[PDB]
Amino acid sequence: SGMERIKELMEMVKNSRMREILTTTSVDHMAVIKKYTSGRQEKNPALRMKWMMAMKYPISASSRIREMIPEKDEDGNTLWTNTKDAGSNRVLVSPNAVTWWNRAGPVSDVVHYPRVYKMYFDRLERLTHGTFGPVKFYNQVKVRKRVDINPGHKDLTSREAQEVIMEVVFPNEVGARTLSSDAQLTITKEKKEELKNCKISPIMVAYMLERELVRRTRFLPIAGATSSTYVEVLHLTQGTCWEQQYTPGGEAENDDLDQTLIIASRNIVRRSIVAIDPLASLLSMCHTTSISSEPLVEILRSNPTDEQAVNICKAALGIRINNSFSFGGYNFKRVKGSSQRTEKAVLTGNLQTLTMTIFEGYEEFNVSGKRASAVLKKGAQRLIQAIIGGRTLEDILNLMITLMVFSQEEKMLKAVRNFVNRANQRLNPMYQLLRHFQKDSSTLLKNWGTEEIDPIMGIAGIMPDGTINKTQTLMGVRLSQGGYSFNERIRVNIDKYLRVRNEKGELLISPEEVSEAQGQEKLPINYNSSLMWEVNGPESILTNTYHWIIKNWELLKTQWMTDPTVLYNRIEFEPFQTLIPKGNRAIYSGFTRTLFQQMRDVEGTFDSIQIIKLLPFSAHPPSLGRTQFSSFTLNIRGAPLRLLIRGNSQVFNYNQMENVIIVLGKSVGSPSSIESAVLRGFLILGKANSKYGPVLTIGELDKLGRGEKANVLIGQGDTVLVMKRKRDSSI
Amino acid sequence: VSSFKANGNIEAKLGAMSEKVNAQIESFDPRTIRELELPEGKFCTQRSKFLLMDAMKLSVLNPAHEGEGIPMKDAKACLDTFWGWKKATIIKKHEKGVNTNYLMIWEQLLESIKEMEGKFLNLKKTNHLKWGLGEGQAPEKMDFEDCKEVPDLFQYKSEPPEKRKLASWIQSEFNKASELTNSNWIEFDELGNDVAPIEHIASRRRNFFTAEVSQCRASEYIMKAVYINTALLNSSCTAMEEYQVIPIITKCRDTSGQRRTNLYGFIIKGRSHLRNDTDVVNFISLEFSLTDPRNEIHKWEKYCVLEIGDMEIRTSISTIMKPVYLYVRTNGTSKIKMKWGMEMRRCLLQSLQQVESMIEAESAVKEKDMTEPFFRNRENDWPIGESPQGIEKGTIGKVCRVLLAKSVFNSIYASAQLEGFSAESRKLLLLIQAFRDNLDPGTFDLKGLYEAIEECIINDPWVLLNASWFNSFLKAVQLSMG
Amino acid sequence: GMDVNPMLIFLKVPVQNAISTTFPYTGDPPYSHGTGTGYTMDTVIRTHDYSSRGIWKTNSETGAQQLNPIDGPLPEDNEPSGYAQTDCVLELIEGLDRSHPGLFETACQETIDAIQQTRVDKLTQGRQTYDWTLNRNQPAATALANTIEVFRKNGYKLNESGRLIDFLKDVLLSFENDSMEVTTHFQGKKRVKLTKKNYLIRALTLNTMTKDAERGKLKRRAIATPGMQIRGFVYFVELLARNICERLEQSGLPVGGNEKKAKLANVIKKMMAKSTDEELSYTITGDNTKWNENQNPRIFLAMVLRITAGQPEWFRDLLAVAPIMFSNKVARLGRGYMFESKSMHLRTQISAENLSDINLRYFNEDTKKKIEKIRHLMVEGTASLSPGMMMGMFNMLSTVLGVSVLNLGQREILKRTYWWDGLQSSDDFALIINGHFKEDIQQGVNHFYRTCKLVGINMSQKKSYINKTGTFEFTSFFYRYGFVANFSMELPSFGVAGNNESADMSIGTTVIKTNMINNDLGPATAQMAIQLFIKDYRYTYRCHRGDTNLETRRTKSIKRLWTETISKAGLLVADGGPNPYNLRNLHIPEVCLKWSLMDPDYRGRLCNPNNPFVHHMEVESTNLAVVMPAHGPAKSLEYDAVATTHSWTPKRNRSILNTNQRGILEDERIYQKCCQVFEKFFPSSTYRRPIGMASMLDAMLSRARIDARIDLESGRISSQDFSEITNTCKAIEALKR
RNA sequence: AGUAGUAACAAGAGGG
RNA sequence: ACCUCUGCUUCUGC
Ligand SMILES: CN1CN([C@@H]2O[C@H](COP(=O)(O)OP(=O)(O)OP(=O)(O)O)[C@@H](O)[C@H]2O)c2nc(N)[nH]c(=O)c21
Ligand SMILES: [Mg+2]
């Protein structure tokens, strides 16, 4: 219509003030005058409301209330007055007016409410159809992470959501820029259809659409699954000392499932490699494990994920594999050659040390895709040459960039224009270098170079542009055609130690190639296995192992005294082994068992805390070693923690005052001057003594002799009198 | 700045700066530190807005009477249960007041109640009532130009508070506050039905909680505070020109289960044109007690106490007449104080969150819910008190009530003294903790820290007690160490 | 004879694990009564005392006495000192540049981009702001409006572009005016001409007042509010500093609670990994004393010039403005004092301005001494305050300074028998010092402390302490081998928020839920918190369940609604309904939770979009409350709620009706009228602010014309409407003429 | 008087 | 003596 609004305007413009304002206030300046006010933000709203709710007319309502409801109700209550609220034409009304309206006012229809407020109603749906398992009690470290908080988002940026909401709610006010993406367009169609004829305030529609469309996150202490449908009920599923097992109603994302499958498979592989029979152990865990009560076996049967650990599990189960990995949404299959993982430091174009892994060796790569394909060659941080094809030039673009990133070349390293987030958590390096060069090739292409390709009337070229050129191109870039048999899944076999070979006997995958990254599952994994602690996670491997030792201490102690080697070999210590760097397991064991023998040998120097502390490190065939250790390294979420041999550390300490052992900050309960189990082949006697010569490091005790007592900087600022023992202890 | 390049600039000036600029660490050993010094002066006196341990109630079991719920009607029904009235006399003078005026207010109140009709009661603005409620006591406001010449024109008194020292009554009140009564004081609104297992677990724990707390005398005070402050804020807002009477009522249930209405006395609200959130409403409180103030007058400095009747006690081998007193007081509060008093139920949360965290910590290590064990296997497993013999331990039930009482007293006796005392002493607590954890603690100006704590102990009875408590803790820790 | 002592629990329970009991936040916090003039004077005096050994100058433009302690004599004792050294500051900032290659350049480039993009209306965000046009505090937007208006009347209107930087240009150019004209309302309206000097003093003015409701302190303190001339310049300086702080792992700002906790944990972990097993490690739980009073504008000028080295001169000069203005600031001295006569039972107000020449007989000894010291600083009713940073505001930039000192502690820089790292957040810090022996620790602590002094940072020796690494405190976070909970900090947020019925329900359940997740609120206590909240809500809003016999102004109407409802379980609590909440559904909006249980007519009334109660303004401020935590500044709180008839708005304060400023209410009413009708033509302007130089009227006319045409050639409208509109448009067109 | 506590309230402002 | 208005609005920053 537009009938009454223009009449109003006419009316207003009759008035001189209003005409002046309307004629001398630009659209920009309207933003200022819209907020012009004498009213201030209430500094104590709780008090003010308590005060005002005692008053007859504390509520301010549109003046039209006066024609919409009676002045008084059946009971004699005045419902509205003609007093203008300060600064507006709203009037002062009673709360009785709100109730009146709610019993006797104009009934509306609410067909759009579920659709506009879908984000909210969906929460209730997921709960109404959720299932509760039981409550378990235990201590678990809840690590603070950024996590998603709104299920059902469309993964739009704030720009793209704005653009979409403008098209949906206010199409004629869009301006010049209209929607690129097909994701944007298909959302626009749907929403336009769902919300047609909608008479709810477009403010609420836009507000809700914005909340719903944009992925929002938050930093929270979270122990379990990090998916948004789990985050949403964190208050219900997780307490300080408890877990309420629960499954929300509705379907999981395929992305969350895939991600969890990879985490599960890696955990299983990593646990299995440290068992006496890895394949037997992996198969066992494959057959007992579930993700959200789905058997892992079924998932592995029907899930297309190609990943090293996943493929090891598939191999074990007789499932055919595609011996490929994904990178940036494109499937990669190495044709010929191989390379080597190497940890080295890299100065980028930002001017930044960032020391993640490199691939170093000859590797031919066939790369399938959505609408594109290519034949990338790679040496050591080299793009030996990438011939790319596709339906559109566009589809050749995405993959073009992806492949320059993937090369690891110095020309893309020194071409970027940080390595962590704000919480200082390390981020994905060879995926972020892609994200950057995604929305800005500019520098890369004009810092890559060009090439003068021969007439060879077939192999075209792409320039530092996107343009096509005849007998020039980028450094090692081509545009040709070629690329069904890439997707064919092959039958493989797998040996006791998880080596995967094709039917011709060629090595496809080895457990050591499996990424060492300890991720966090988006969905709950239940191993249901005697080989895995009931409580998942590396922190929990630590707390559970020590908790278990302590609670079984009487048995374990007598086993320590009578039958050491059986104790060392117990299966409960194998998960803990996965936290110890592979290269240290044997020497750490050797060191530990020797210290334990010295404790046995030198009577009256028993120490239960020292035994408990070091015991897990005994669980590996020991090697002979000279090396003295002041600490053992554990790797917890990609970061070394050091457990000190002598006394308390941040990782493991005994607190006198509580009389409890605290492990990564969690209590796991509790069970002469001579220390028999700190140095191999020495005793600590007590306080250092100037009347026994100067202070040596540990690594200078080297050349002492039986009976010969020194002063040592033993650790954490202490100096102690040691003595090289007269006899030895053997293992 | 644009061409600046550093070359030993910091190092040079460090080498030119006096060694008196330093942060020398002094080793911290709780065995060799002194107790906090408390202020000296007259003894501290009561400053709650209502009587605590000394309160007396007239009550009606299962009230039925016309208009059950209407405060004044309930009050009359409670009054009607008492037959021991008698001509009022003054037995303990408010030294600084016109004690005659207080007597006359009581008589006026009683008469006006006797004759009231309607649901509310506004008292006549007699001379005695206007005095008690500070009518006209604000100086007439004038332009400076018109009074700049008055000889005694002066800045408002802006000086440190008068100091007062600890007296035994505050500890005694605290003891009583943490004790069980045989009445349930808290009635809770409904929850949605329990569905999740954790909900069922929580409701079992919650019921143990209420069963420790609902009967706790601290919870009686909560209900007194919430009722008084709610009625006084509503009345303050709606009857700004009226001397409105507010009966002091709570309702409880016996352990038998029967409802009971309780009348403790009355409040008379003064005028209440409250603008700023600190602006004062004067009121008079008139509260029943069997306590004879003359035995402990320092507790009752601001009160005029009347003898108003006798109470028959009858073991039916004897029967004895117990004087009934009326504790009468001018007092004041503000919108900010009333608001917080209205919210005193939050004290339940501070206590129970702590208790629950203790149950949960143990549960984690035991890998099971330790609620029933904690509440049922009453070992004395928490130090919560001291006798002449030494440290006494109590059950988790006792802990819940002591922590509740602490929280409730923090609300009743909220002060800047308490704020600063709490924050500064907390550092000293943490230093002691660091010593006991073997973390080799050090200070930079311990003397300064002590002065920072001690200047906060001025005259407030609760702060004086909390300072005393810190010292007892320090001594106990010292005894357990050397 | 057993005496109960709750402190004895600490014999058994580690202090951090029962730390909640040391926080008395169930009682009302302390409030100031009356003037802040005494505290303001205090602060002004202290700030000068700490810098007293510097140089005095008279400002050419304002005549203000200005003390300069920079590059002054070096500290000689442990008292708070302002003798920061330019060369030492520059060394630290250079050290930080070295440690973060490209960081300054990037942060600068982001600021330049922001300068170009930022709209004038950005300044509409903010709280009470000194308004030089009124010589009074006003809301930010009103203060902005007033400055813009007075500017344009005096010939400054580069800001008509709509860009912030053009308003900044206007600000500087305004200082050339011989005679800025404003209008007072005599005690009516009247033209006042300010001298160039008067205007400049007002432009450089901080208003001062006392801080209420602060916890943990016996005594009150003064705070300050700057005006509009400075605010836009502060905006950009702090944006620059923010960009830098975000990339500093030692910055506590601007990350919030959980992320701050993550970053502290990280830094311990980092530190511990980087040390050797033979090193000792100690943590200082650290507080700076007299932070605001000892930081110096001149030093921040140096920091800004250094950080922006190599950048375009226009940008450098732009950023330098805020520091320069702060160097030349003055404080309003507050409301003055009240006096009283016992003999004559009277009382009177004197002004802070009166203090320049009032007879001193009226005052107590303390106050009289204050006034005597202040007099030499007074200029046109204000006190000169060149040193210090009373108003604060450079939170981010002072954090950069602190971090720069932390950054010095790397082993490769120091090459000593000790080294350090830590976290800095304004005037809180945690320092982790490592070395081989205790004497290395002491030396390192002395090195750190003395360096701090050389740049005007003063560690509080009374509030700080040191222990072996493992436990520490940082901004009422307590770490005992990992952060523990402090539930009591949050207790004040448990209650009825006082926004409206709808918002308060969602806020109340969300508070319980977030405390379960973050502050170890146990499930039993959480259930009780639901029950206690519901009760408080029912009493506050008088919305007791429809089957109850409590008498209020609302009870009769709610009972009717009750007796007339079939499905009573569908009634909102605010409509006399039952509480549906338990632990499992705290994250579900009430209206959603009861939707399927509601009588369709009730629902249809409740959710009628046509109702006259709801007050929608803007998408960007929808479902937003402001809450005041126990500690720290006021915060926006998002809540989830369906807009209903319970989403109402309480009435405005009416005290202005009795004042000279009552004309403002009418101006407000007009503007809203104009903005509302505008929104009938451009609905989208409630979502995204419209852009344009066109007048509001020309924009609306063009919209009406085109809308009527499409209406016609879509079928929606008849010709005998399309006539009426296009005609009405032409009348407006002419009436405009 | 009382509240309070470094300065305030114990009604303010306006009209007549 | 009456009449009228006001109850966060000369005072709450970052
Ligand atoms: C850059 N890449 C990527 N890539 C393989 O592709 C896999 C997936 O890449 P990614 O994004 O780093 O994922 P991933 O390593 O699984 O991540 P994470 O282990 O952190 O969970 C790598 O683990 C690696 O095996 C490579 N393989 C070879 N041969 N050469 C290369 O240059 C590269
Ligand atoms: Mg400070």
SS (H, E, C) C517-566: HHCCCCHHHHHHHHHHHHHHHHHHHCCCCCCCCCCCCCHHHHHHHHHCCC
What value, to the nearest 5°, has the Cα angle with vertex B16 and ends B11 and B17?
100
Q: H/E/C letters for each residue in A635-671?
A: EECCEEEEEECCCCCCCEEEECCCCEEEECCEECCCC
Say if CB A582 and CB A634 are below 8 A apart: no
Q: B284: which strand partners? A: B268, B330
Write the DSSP symbol of residue C194: -
Based on the fold, state whether residues B361 and B442 are members of the same structural domain.
yes
Query: What's the rounded Cα separation, in Å, for the pair C418 and C666?
Result: 67
Q: Give how far Cα C731 sits from Cα of A6, C702, C734, C737, Å.
A: 11, 14, 5, 10
Tokens encoding A170: 């206010």
C16 neighbors C480 (Cβ within 8 angstroms): yes
For residues C246 and C341, is the Cβ–Cβ distance under 8 A?
no
- Contacting partners of chain C (3+ CB pairs under 8 A): A, B
> Any CB–CB contact under 8 A between B452 and chain C?
yes
Rounded Cα distance, C56 and A298, in Å: 83
Alpha-carbon torsion A175, A180, A182, A187, what sign? negative
CA–CA distance, B361 with C690 (Å, rounded to integer): 56
What long-range pairs does B34-38 form, CB within 8 A, spacing at least 24? B34/B450, B35/B471, B35/B474, B35/B475, B36/B425, B36/B450, B36/B453, B36/B454, B36/B457, B36/B467, B36/B470, B36/B471, B37/B454, B38/B165, B38/B166, B38/B457, B38/B464, B38/B467, B38/B468
- Nearest CB neighbour to B407, from listed C26, C34, C363: C26
C713 CA to chain B: closest CA distance, Å?
56
Rounded to 10 deg, the angle between the C313-327 and C297-307 helix axes is 170
- B449 and C CB contact within 8 Å: yes
Burial of A72 (0-12, 13-18, 19+ CB in 10 A): middle
Q: Is residue B194 part of a domain?
A: yes
In 3D space, the residue among A678, A671, A661, A658 whose CA is nearest the CA of residue A720 turns out to be A678
Residue with tokens 């037995």: B91
Using the 3D structure, point to which of B296, B315, B342 is the last residue of a domain: B342
**Burial environment of residue B5 by CB neighbours within 10 A (0 to 12, 13 to 18, 19 or more):** exposed
Say how far apart CA A657 and CA C291 lie, in whole Å: 37
Tokens 């289960």 belong to B257
Strands (E), C65-204: 65-68, 129-131, 136-138, 181-184, 190-193
Distance, CA of C141 to CA of C128 (rounded, Å): 9
Q: Which of A1, A98, A665 sits opposite C613 (nearest CB)?
A: A98
Contact residues for A433 (Cβ-Cβ < 8 A; gap 6+): A405, A412, A413, A416
CA distance A7 to A2: 9
Neighbours of C412 (CB within 10 A): 6
Phi, psi of C116, rounded to the nearest 5 degrees: -65, -40
C-alpha–C-alpha distance, residues A668 and A672, integer Å: 27
DSSP C66: E
Q: Report the nearest-CA residue for atom 8 of ligand 1.
A: A327
Q: Which two tokens stand for residue B13?
A: 């000036």
C297 within 8 A of C327, measured Cβ to Cβ: yes
CB within 8 Å: B437 and A655: yes
Asked if the Cβ–Cβ distance from B197 to A44 is below 8 Å, we say no
- Domain end among B342, B361, B382: B342
Q: How many helices (H) and strands (E) does chain B have?
A: 14, 17
Q: Test A235 with C616 for CB contact under 8 angstroms.
A: no
Which ligand is closest to the CA of C457, given by its number?
A: 2
Tell me: do B228 and B258 sit in the same domain. Answer: yes
Q: How far is CA A466 from CA A388, A396, A462, A631, C634, in A?
A: 13, 10, 6, 56, 51
> Would you say C281 and C419 are in contact if contact means Cβ atoms under 8 Å apart?
no
**Any strand D atom closer than 7 Å to C335 CB:** yes
Q: Which one, of C342, C364, C359, C339, lies nearest residue C350 by Cα?
A: C339
d(CA C262, CA C244): 19
**3 state DSSP class of C401:** helix
Ligand 1 near A635 CB (within 6 A)? no
Cα separation, A45 vs A42, in Å, equals 6
Q: What's the gap between Cα C407 and its chain centre?
A: 28
Any ligand 1 atom below 6 A from CB of A327: yes
Ligand in closest contact with the CA of A356: 1
Q: Rounded to whole angstroms, how far apart are CA atoms C321 and C230?
A: 8
Nearest neighbour of C363 by CB, restricted to B155, B408, B443: B155
Question: What is the stated resolution of the deposited model, in angstroms?
Answer: 2.0
| Angle of the A278-288 helix axis to the A254-272 helix axis, nearest 10 | 150
Preceding peptide of C578 cis, ω within 30°: no
For B207, residues 6+ apart whose C-beta sits below 8 A from its C-beta are: none
Q: Are B203 and B232 found together in one domain?
A: no
How far does the CA of residue C181 sit from the closest CA of chain A (Å)?
A: 20
The reply to whether B235 and B89 lie within a common domain is yes
Q: Which of A634, A354, A585 is nearest to C269 (CA)?
A: A634
Does the beta carbon of B21 lie under 8 angstroms from any beta carbon of chain A?
Answer: no
Q: Which amino acid, C226?
A: P
CA-nearest residue to A241 within chain B is B364
CA dist., res. A340 & res. A359, Å (int)? 5
Q: Please give, rounded to a whole number of angstroms, the shortest distance from the CA of A3 to a CA of chain C.
A: 7
B417/B430 same-domain check: yes
Query: Is-contact C491 C25, C-beta < 8 A?
Result: yes
Asked if the C-beta of B222 comes within 8 angstroms of chain C's C-beta atoms, the answer is no
Instruction: Among A51, A139, A240, select the one facing B357 at the smallest CB separation.
Output: A240
Taking the CB of residue A284, how many other CB atoms lie within 10 A of it? Answer: 18
Contact C200, C60 (CB under 8 A): no
Where helices occur in A25-117 by DSSP H, the ranges are 27-33, 45-52, 65-68, 96-104, 113-116
d(CA A54, CA B235): 8
- Whether chain A has a CB inside 8 Å of the CB on B437: the answer is yes
Instruction: Give the residue whose CA is nearest to atom 12 of ligand 1.
Output: A430
* Dihedral sign from CA coordinates of B331, B337, B342, B347: negative
B159 touches strand D (CB under 7 A): yes
Identify the closest residue of chain B to A662 by CA–CA distance: B365
C1' of D4 to CA of C286 (Å): 35
Contacts of C603 in chain A (CB under 8 A): 110
Contact of A569 with A619, CB cutoff 8 Å: yes
Residue B269 lies in a domain: yes
Alpha-carbon span C483 to A208, nearest angstrom: 36
Is B462 part of any domain?
A: yes
A524 touches A616 (CB < 8 A)? no
Mapping DSSP onto H, E and C, the string for C645-658 reads CCCCEECCCCHHHH
Q: What is d(CA C465, CA C483) in angstroms, rounded to the nearest whole number?
A: 18
CA of C136 to C1' of E10 (A): 7
Q: Which residue has the tokens 């129970």?
A: B352
Residue B157 · residue C340 · CB < 8 Å:
no
Find chain A residues with C-beta within 8 A of B481's C-beta.
none
Q: Which residue has the tokens 């803990």?
A: A576
Q: How far is the C-alpha of B225 from the C-alpha of B210, rounded, in Å?
A: 19
Q: Rounded to an integer, what distance in angstroms lies between the CA atom of residue A135 and that of residue C39?
A: 56
Chain B closest-CA separation from residue A683 CA (Å): 24
CB A323 less than 6 A from any atom of ligand 1? no
B337 and B358 part of one domain: no
Contact B195 C584 (CB under 8 A): yes
Pairwise CA distance, residues A645 & A592, whole Å: 9
* B428 touches B453 (CB < 8 A): yes
Looking at the structure, tell me whether residues B452 and B472 fall in a common domain. Answer: yes
- Please check whether residue C480 is in contact with residue A655, taking contact to mean a CB–CB distance below 8 angstroms: no
Give me B459's structure tokens: 């005259």
Strand D within 7 Å of which CB atoms in B 398-437?
415-416
Q: How far, in whole angstroms, is CA B166 from its chain's centroid?
A: 16
Q: How many CB atoms lie within 10 A of CB B267?
A: 23
* Alpha-carbon dihedral angle through residues C107, C110, C111, C116, given to the nearest 10 degrees: 170
- Ligand 1 pocket check for A363: Cβ under 6 Å: yes
- Distance, Å, C352 CA → D6 C1': 17
Answer whether residue B87 is part of any domain.
yes
What are the structure tokens assigned to C15, written together? 């202090």
| Host domain of residue B306 | 44-137+216-342
Do B286 and B246 lie in one domain? The reply is yes
Q: Establish whether residue A179 lines the binding site of ligand 1, counting it when its CB lies within 6 angstroms of any ligand atom.
A: no
β-pairing, A709-715 with A695-696? parallel
Q: Considering the domain boundaries, does residue B230 fall inside one?
A: yes
Interface of C with B in 120-179 (CB under 8 A): none
**B346: closest CA of chain A, how far (Å):** 14
Tokens 């009316």 label which residue? Answer: A11
CB C423 within 8 A of CB C264: yes
Distance of alpha carbon C400 from alpha carbon C299, whole angstroms = 12
Is C712's Cβ below 8 Å from some Cβ in A? Answer: no
Close Cβ partners of B240 (under 8 Å, ≥ 6 residues apart): B271, B272, B273, B274
Report residue A581 CA to chain centroid gap.
Answer: 23
Contact A77 C144 (CB under 8 A): no
One-letter amino acid for residue A18 of the chain: M
Phi-psi region of A675 (alpha: psi -120 to 50; beta: other; left: phi over 0): beta
Which residues, including other chains, have CB under 8 Å from residue B396's CB and lie 6 or more apart? Answer: B355, B358, B359, B374, B375, B381, B382
DSSP A593-638: HHHHHHHHHSTT---HHHHHHHGGGG-S---------SEEEEEETT
On the CB side of C237, CA atoms within 13 Å amount to 32
Burial of C420 (C-beta count, 10 Å sphere; 0-12/13-18/19+): buried
CA distance C492 to C502: 20
CA–CA gap between residue C82 and residue A73 (Å, rounded)? 69
Q: Whose CA is nearest to atom 14 of ligand 1?
A: A515
Helix (H) / strand (E) containing A485: none
Gap sites in chain A (C to N > 2.5 Å), preceding residue numbers: 417, 483, 671
Q: Which two tokens stand for residue A612?
A: 């408990």
Phi, psi dihedral angles at A641 (to 5 degrees): -105, 140
Q: Within A228-360, where are the H helices? A: 228-231, 234-237, 254-272, 278-288, 296-302, 308-316
Q: Are B17 and B447 in contact (CB under 8 A)?
A: no
A198 phi/psi in degrees, rounded to 5: -75, 130
Helix axes C313-327, C228-246, angle to 10 degrees: 120
The one-letter amino acid at A241: C
Question: Is residue A656 exposed (0-12), middle (13-18) or buried (19+ Cβ within 10 Å)?
Answer: exposed
Ligand 1 pocket: which of A359, A404, A425 to mutate (most atoms within 8 A of CB): A359
Q: Token pair for residue C390?
A: 């009373």
Helix (H) or strand (E) holding C409: none
User: What token pair was written down for B140?
Assistant: 């007439």
Please give the Cα distance from C391 to C206 (Å, whole number): 7
Name the CA radius of gyration of chain C, rounded.
30
C-alpha A230: how far from its chain's center? 14
Whether C288 has a binding-site annotation, put simply, is: yes
B242 and B97 in one domain?
yes
* One domain, residues B337 and B390: no
Nearest chain B residue to A138 by CA distance is: B364
Partner C, chain B 76-135, Cβ-Cβ below 8 Å: none
Q: Which helix (H) or strand (E) holds B100?
A: helix B99-115
DSSP B135: T
Question: Looking at the domain assignment, is residue B395 inside a domain?
Answer: yes
Say if B14 falls within a structural domain: no
- The answer on B242 and B202 residing in a single domain is no
Answer whether any strand D atom is within 7 A of the Cβ of B333.
yes
Paired strand residues for C349? C338
Among C535, C552, C651, C720, the strongest candidate for a mutation testing the A interface, having the largest count of A CBs within 10 A, is C651
Crossing angle (nearest 10°) for helices C297-307 and C86-99: 30
Asked if residue B324 and residue B238 are part of one domain, the reply reads: yes
H/E/C letters for each residue in C243-267? HHHHCCCCECCCCCHHHHHHHHHHH
Chain E: nucleotides below 7 Å from protein CB are 5-14
State the Cα–Cα distance between residues C737 and C725, nearest whole angstrom.
19
How far apart, in Å, are the Cα atoms of A455 and each of A377, A459, A467, B376? 22, 8, 18, 93
- Measuring from the CA of residue C335 to each C1', which nucleotide is nearest? E11
In three-state secondary structure terms, C569 is: helix
Interface of C with A in 156-215 (CB under 8 A): 160, 162, 213
State the Cα–Cα distance between residues A322 and A249, nearest whole angstrom. Answer: 33
Burial of A538 (0-12, 13-18, 19+ CB in 10 A): buried
The count of domains in chain B is 2
Measured at the alpha carbon of residue A44, what is the angle toward residues A42 and A48, in degrees to the nearest 5? 85
CB C611 within 8 A of CB A102: no
Q: d(Cα A14, Cα C651) in Å, to the nearest integer?
A: 30
Amino acid at position A375, single letter: V
Q: Which of A430, A435, A509 to mutate to test the pocket of ligand 1 (most atoms within 8 A of CB)?
A: A430
